[PDB]
Amino acid sequence: SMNPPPPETSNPNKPKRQTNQLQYLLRVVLKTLWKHQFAWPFQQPVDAVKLNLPDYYKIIKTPMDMGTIKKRLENNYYWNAQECIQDFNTMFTNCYIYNKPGDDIVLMAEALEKLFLQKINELPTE
Numbered sequence: 001s002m003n004p005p006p007p008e009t010s011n012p013n014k015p016k017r018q019t020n021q022l023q024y025l026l027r028v029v030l031k032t033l034w035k036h037q038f039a040w041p042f043q044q045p046v047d048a049v050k051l052n053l054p055d056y057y058k059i060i061k062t063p064m065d066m067g068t069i070k071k072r073l074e075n076n077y078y079w080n081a082q083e084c085i086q087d088f089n090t091m092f093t094n095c096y097i098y099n100k101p102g103d104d105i106v107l108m109a110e111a112l113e114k115l116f117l118q119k120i121n122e123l124p125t126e
């Protein structure tokens with residue numbers, strides 16, 4: 001009946017960079033997924049209390065969501081594109097771990113992940 005602290009979006013102890021790939025990840029990848037009709041479940045940490053999913057954070061130990069990714073990108077939290085790509089894949093993975101195949105939420109994750117994959121296919125060279 002309690003949500004964990006969300007993932008950090010700011011860490012002054014963490015070295016940070018602005019690379020053209022990270023810019024792509026914000027301006028193209030995030031923006032494309034964020035605007036999608038199916039983005040809303042993924043635009044903020046899972047509120048396991050409001051969704052009455054007390055076991056969500058028992059099962060999901062590496063939570064990730066696009067709200068967090070967005071803030072991280074906006075805050076230049078990352079060092080490289082792979083960190084950010086990993087966050088996206090963590091988000092998708094958590095969905096597929098927690099839910100069943102064919103669940104609406106999985107279909108939404110899959111639709112977003114298809115766009116994710118299409119966009120990162122044209123990730124520019126550094």
Ligand SMILES: COc1cc(/C=C/C(=O)O)ccc1O
Binds near residue numbers: 040041042046051105
């Ligand atoms: C069904 O479980 C999930 C729910 C959500 C979001 C729900 C919402 O914002 O209402 C996100 C990921 C999940 O795996």
